[PDB]
Design a protein around this ligand. Structure first.
Ligand SMILES: CCCC[C@@H](C=O)NC(=O)[C@H](CC(C)C)NC(=O)[C@H](CC(C)C)NC(C)=O
Ligand SMILES: CCCC[C@@H](C=O)NC(=O)[C@H](CC(C)C)NC(=O)[C@H](CC(C)C)NC(C)=O
Lengths: 237, 202, 237, 237, 237, 202
């Protein structure tokens, strides 16, 4: 009899329902290694009529921070812009870039309010925030405003698949290219097949020059190729 | 009032005297004009006592909260930017204060001189503040060298503020000094200062 | 027909449902002795993919105050930040650290409002606030805004277990190390097994140098070890 | 179809439900004699883990006014602080201490509003306000905002017990010590047994030096003892 | 689906339910004669523990105005204070006492709003406002904000009894004492017995010195006595 | 107006005279200028009568409420900080008042002199306030010693305010004194003061 309230189980149905929306979302993956953090997203489209070359799934928050999103697409938009504003405000007041951790807490606090203030609904979206403070970092957010730091993970429908996979293959010492390839593979198993460089997006931030760059389609060819390798092989069972 | 600050090769030194006046009336012989902001950051205050004191509290509280919340110590740049914005926001009825905020941080060593309107100059070596600053600048610009070490820099500081007390009736009564090395944030105590200026004339 | 209202029993269901959320929360323990107060929390994770070395469960409020939380994770965040602001405000206006007792009353008053103001819901979280005024102190809060001072206690799912245990073992004269070990044990019984130093957090504030310090993983080894002792032993029945 | 509204009976269910909350409340007693007014409360705890020496049940409002509370514990807090503010305000504007009667009317008016303003719920608490204007005075408040001046009474679960008792034993000429003992007795019958000085609180305000003082545990011994006397004796039937 | 709305009958249930609350109220009577107007109220208590000598049921609004109340006791409080403020405001703006008629209209307008503004409920109280402008006057108010000028009447549970009685006995030429006695009698029949001076309150305002005075318990003796007379006699059938 | 305050080895002493003026018009021969804030805390007020009286009320009320709510007595530092902030907030239309807040608390003994803009100086020994302060400072700085005890300190206080009344037409009419020892918060009464200055000349 209100909006977002407690159930006898002590849970928030609105938040849980919001989570159902993120599950239906396109899958996004993030991997962290020593040399940096990669974020790769499913860019696949369902019609030759959509401008695929345009569609962007990995967003630049600041120079050293990017993010991937999943859930209600419209809500996600306001959320990343929100994160962008948040980043610039930090510069405006301290003349310094915001840490990936701080930025995450801030949008998470934002989302949390839409969780307990009657005349509003929660954000049907989950976020993958990656960047490099003094070390590479990866965080994933929940519709409730909960924050979690992962070494590697995913959000979206293909979640579980890549989660189980990384659970076995991921390693603290992976190289940048190894780490990335491991990611393209996870994606592959996720969509249940070999990947097409033309419909996947990859962004990263290397610990050397803390600046978000996005892997070009050409630089992708080799990685997708080397990944499709182990994918076909892995798609035996 | 007179306060100095110098960036040495091995740290930062900041010093002030202890006089507080209202006209020719010496209201205080032991006013505090040096505050600790972070572990390796200090601040000297020249200007309106009430305004400086008020701002000092705000500065401290915000530095604290910054760290407690982000689990990182704020850089002098951050505090300086923070304070600038606050000062400038009140530009039409400014806080009559001249601040010196400096120390050591992930970015290095530095000192910032900030005015009522939030105009911040990044001091890469020497700086004086207050009614005595111009006299203090005399010796500072005379004996300073970039290779100076914090240990002789505190002598230099006492030296400058001592000269200033000789020509600025608004300055005097004693002098606080603070060394910010890295392995430490040291405050000399009357005894130690009294013995450092003892190699001069008083 | 509103939000948080009275039932014919004279109870607030929303508040009670909020309490159901805290019960599901990860367990946290607090023990007070003469030499100080310890707060230990279950840091255990459910995936090798989460950055365990990062996850923080014991928060520093001020120099002499820390707190543990249980219940909705996102609500908890705003609540400890709220407590942090509250602490600094005290400094700002009186030029003095806030007492643990006062701080507690303040966040409890804060939480109490979300209990009777229609367009909002209660905080699905309970807090353990420990610090040292002139003597060590431990308070635990409730979603309703109720405050209680304990000698020793716990919040979260493992609550009852450690409550019954302390009910028998706790003693007003425990030594700091004794008191702490008694806590690691309570935790052990709670999770129904021996503890792994690598997945439990401990923070404290000793009456000598009233400053919150957090037990390092190395300084933990001996304590966990000496605790796992009496644990195995105690896990006979 | 709103919040606090009239029933066909002409009653306010929310208010009555709030009353159900106060009945479940810990019992508190108040006795007025010529020499002053005493307020005694059940300080009894349900765990050796709670700091009993701390728990406070009788509050100082001003120098000449104290109060006991019953019902929702969190609500009670805001209500006494409210009373405290109210008292200082009187000083601020008239440079004079507020009378017990006036203070009562004010918090009652405060409580009355949460009784007819839709976006809010009533305070699930009842108050015993005692002090000494030119003569000792005792008032008890209701969740509805109703005010009543008693010679002696109680609120909380043990209400009826002690009410029936005072209904027979109370006398307009009781001495201070007699009046107090009569009160510890009522408490005794209330909790159905002899009292333990260590778990009951007593505060008062004597007409001589109009200042709220609280009976020390040592000063209690004799009174509790002399009361347990007539208690055991009275617990025959 | 709101709060105070129209029923298909064209009536306001909330207002009618509020009226049910006034019926349950303690009875109050008012009688007007040429020499002035009297207001008498049932002061009877249900426990020897209540300070009967204190309990006030007839309130002074201004020098020439008093009022009696019936219904929710807390609501009544705010309503008379409201009337009091209203009276002074008149003085503040015109440097003149407000007429009884004007004062009544004003609180009635006040009450009327809580009758059509969604986020609030009606006042569960009725009022008897008596005073002397240039001639004695008596008005009675309704939870709806309706105003009525009576020669003689009553509100509360004993309403009908005294209404039927005055309907027969009341006379335009009654003397002050006659009119008053007629009132004590109505009260007697109301409570179904002889009256006790010690538990009834009487206030009035004589046309000669337009100032509200309250009949002292001693000045009452004779009247109650002379009334109990015709009461016993009248309590035959 | 002239008020003094001295921190002795065994407590705190504060005193003021009783004159209130408006130009040369002597409006009062018995104005109250010394207030009790806490059990071991007092405050002297110099400046605008109305402003001082208003602030006095606020100060007391907040000191009380502080204790009633936190069951701890507020430290002079806490009351001084509180007052400084209030004063400074109104820095663009300040309360024309010079305040003296001091006494004994868990932190020790101390006195604070606070100006219209909330500029607070921590008096570690001697302090005077009001139109006669400069004359009072004369004798205070002449006869004071840190080892002075509260008992002779009240004499000194009377001594200084007596000199001041001799050269400040705005001061005079009598003098209140207050001793803050610990075992007590004493106020001397006319008789006792009249007998203390009797060992002088009037
Ligand atoms: C306590 C350290 C403050 C710095 C020190 C240095 O200049 N400032 C001062 O002493 C300043 C100087 C004036 C020119 C603004 N004095 C002041 O601000 C004095 C302070 C009173 C408490 C005595 N007020 C006025 C109106 O002058
Ligand atoms: C009563 C405590 C205040 C101290 C006392 C001593 O000097 N102060 C005063 O007497 C101050 C002095 C002026 C210069 C601000 N006098 C005043 O504030 C008076 C107040 C009148 C009500 C008599 N004059 C004016 C013009 O406001």
């Amino acid at each position: 009899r209100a909006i977002t309230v407690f159930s006898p189980d002590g849970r928030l149905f609105q938040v849980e329902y919001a989570r159902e929306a993120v599950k239906r979302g396109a899958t996004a993956i993030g991997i962290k290694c020593k040399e940096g953090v990669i974020l790769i997203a499913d860019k696949r489209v369902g019609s030759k009529l959509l401008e695929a070359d345009t569609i962007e799934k990995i967003y630049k928050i600041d120079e050293h921070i990017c993010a991937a999103t999943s859930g209600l697409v419209a809500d996600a938009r306001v959320l990343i812009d929100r994160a962008r504003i948040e980043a610039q405000i930090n510069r405006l007041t301290y003349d310094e870039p915001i840490t990936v951790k701080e930025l995450a807490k801030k949008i998470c606090d934002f989302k949390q309010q839409y969780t307990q203030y009657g005349g509003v609904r929660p954000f049907g979206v989950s976020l993958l925030i990656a960047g490099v403070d003094e070390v590479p970092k990866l965080y994933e957010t929940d519709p409730s405003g909960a924050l979690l730091e992962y070494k590697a993970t995913a959000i979206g429908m293909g979640r579980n698949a890549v989660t189980e996979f990384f659970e076995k293959e991921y390693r603290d010492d992976l190289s940048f290219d190894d780490a990335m390839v491991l990611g393209l593979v996870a994606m592959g198993l996720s969509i249940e097949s070999e990947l097409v460089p033309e419909n996947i997006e990859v962004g990263y931030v290397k610990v050397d020059d803390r600046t978000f760059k996005e892997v070009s389609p050409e630089e992708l060819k080799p990685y997708v190729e080397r990944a499709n390798e182990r994918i076909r092989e892995l798609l035996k069972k | 009032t007179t306060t100095v600050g110098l960036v040495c090769k091995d740290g930062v030194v900041m010093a002030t005297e202890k006089r507080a006046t209202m006209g020719n009336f010496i209201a205080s012989k032991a006013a505090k004009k040096i505050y600790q902001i972070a572990d390796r950051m200090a601040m000297t205050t020249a200007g309106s006592v009430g305004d400086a004191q008020f701002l000092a509290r705000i500065i401290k509280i915000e530095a604290n909260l910054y760290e407690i919340r982000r689990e990182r110590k704020p850089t002098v740049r951050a505090i300086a930017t923070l304070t600038s914005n606050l000062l400038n926001s009140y530009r039409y009825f400014p806080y009559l204060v001249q601040l010196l905020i400096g120390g050591i941080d992930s970015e290095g060593k530095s000192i910032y001189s900030i005015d009522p309107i939030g105009g911040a100059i990044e001091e890469k070596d020497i700086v004086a503040t207050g009614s005595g600053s111009l006299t203090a600048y005399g010796v500072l610009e005379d004996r300073f060298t970039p290779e100076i070490g914090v240990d002789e820099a505190v002598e230099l500081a006492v030296r400058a503020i001592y000269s200033a007390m000789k020509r600025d009736s608004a300055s005097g009564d004693g002098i606080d000094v603070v060394k910010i090395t890295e392995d430490e944030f040291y405050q000399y105590s009357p005894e130690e200062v009294e013995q450092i200026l003892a190699k001069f004339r008083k």
